[PDB]
């Protein structure tokens, strides 16, 4: 893309339906997660809600955050005002805030979600982020 990568986190997105959604980024690039958004004319039953976790590979592979991940974001507002609720992650080297999140060139990071109304925790929506080595990034 460019420097910011938009990810529409919903089951209708063909990118997630193919199950291998991943993005190649460089340090300081951003990830913008767009939560499922529905107009007010929806019974909130077909409305998707998720809790997003940052997990390790095994957690990513099994769709399980337990003992292998951190709760990251909550898509709990399917009727937010100005468009879809949005969460952003900057692939920075050093966090200016205590135990914040740091990333390193040449490493892979993973995110998975579990539906709030719960569907079965089976084939979760997931995303792999590959932070490119310094040699690749310009």
């Amino acid at each position: 893309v460019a420097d910011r990568y938009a990810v529409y986190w919903n089951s209708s997105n063909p990118r997630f339906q193919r199950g291998d959604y991943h993005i190649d980024v460089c340090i300081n690039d951003y990830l913008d997660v767009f939560c499922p958004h529905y107009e007010d004319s929806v019974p909130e039953d077909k409305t998707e809600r998720y809790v997003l976790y940052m997990v390790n590979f095994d957690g990513y592979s099994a769709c399980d955050h337990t003992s292998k991940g951190f709760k990251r974001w909550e898509c709990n507002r399917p009727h937010s005002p100005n468009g879809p609720l949005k969460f952003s992650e900057k692939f920075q080297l050093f966090t200016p805030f205590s135990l914040g999140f740091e990333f390193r060139p040449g490493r892979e990071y993973f995110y998975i979600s579990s539906a709030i109304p719960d569907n079965g925790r089976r084939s979760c929506l997931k995303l792999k982020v590959f932070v490119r080595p310094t040699n690749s990034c310009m």
Partner: protein, 181 residues
């Protein structure tokens, strides 16, 4: 007695504060001392020389105050805990203010320098963070309060200047005292 003129923690939206150099301060999601979600600002260009990063708040209505108090909550990373240590890394930032009868601030309007901006002080942290801890965050957020008082105009802006540090401006609370006595 205390009257709040502005409090970044009650935003419940986006702060939208002005950043002179876009490559400097940036708005990011953060946490309060009592473990709560708020909007914060951070800068960490420790690999770039000649840093002079500015951050400007919205126009703040005076509401009958002359003596303004600024409560700042922040975290500053220890320059020695950051691998490539050039020597320009710093752990302090300056606070300034600029009063005006109207908003009028644009993106260039009030020059970004000590000249038109009045310096309140150079803020230092009593506790910089490197890592430590072995159970969870419990204490690492600094709290510094300063005052200034020429303020006679309808409102004023506040500005924070970074010059090569790695820090996070967690919260800013502005208030004045209108003693009933």
């Amino acid at each position: 007695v205390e009257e709040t003129l502005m409090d970044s923690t009650t935003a419940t939206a986006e702060l939208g504060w002005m950043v002179h150099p876009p490559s400097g301060w940036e708005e990011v999601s953060g946490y309060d001392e009592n473990m709560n979600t708020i909007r914060t600002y951070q800068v960490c260009n420790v690999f770039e020389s000649s840093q002079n990063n500015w951050l400007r708040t919205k126009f703040i209505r005076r509401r009958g105050a002359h003596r303004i108090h600024v409560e700042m909550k922040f975290s500053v990373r220890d320059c020695s805990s950051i691998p490539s240590v050039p020597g320009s890394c710093k752990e302090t930032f300056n606070l300034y203010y600029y009063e005006a009868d109207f908003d009028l601030a644009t993106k260039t309007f009030p020059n970004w320098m000590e000249n038109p901006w009045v310096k309140v002080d150079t803020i230092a942290a009593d506790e910089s963070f490197s890592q430590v801890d072995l159970g969870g965050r419990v204490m690492k957020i600094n709290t510094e309060v300063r005052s200034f008082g020429p303020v006679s105009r309808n409102g004023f802006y506040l500005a924070f200047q970074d010059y090569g540090g790695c820090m996070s401006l967690i919260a800013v609370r502005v208030f004045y005292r209108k003693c009933p006595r």
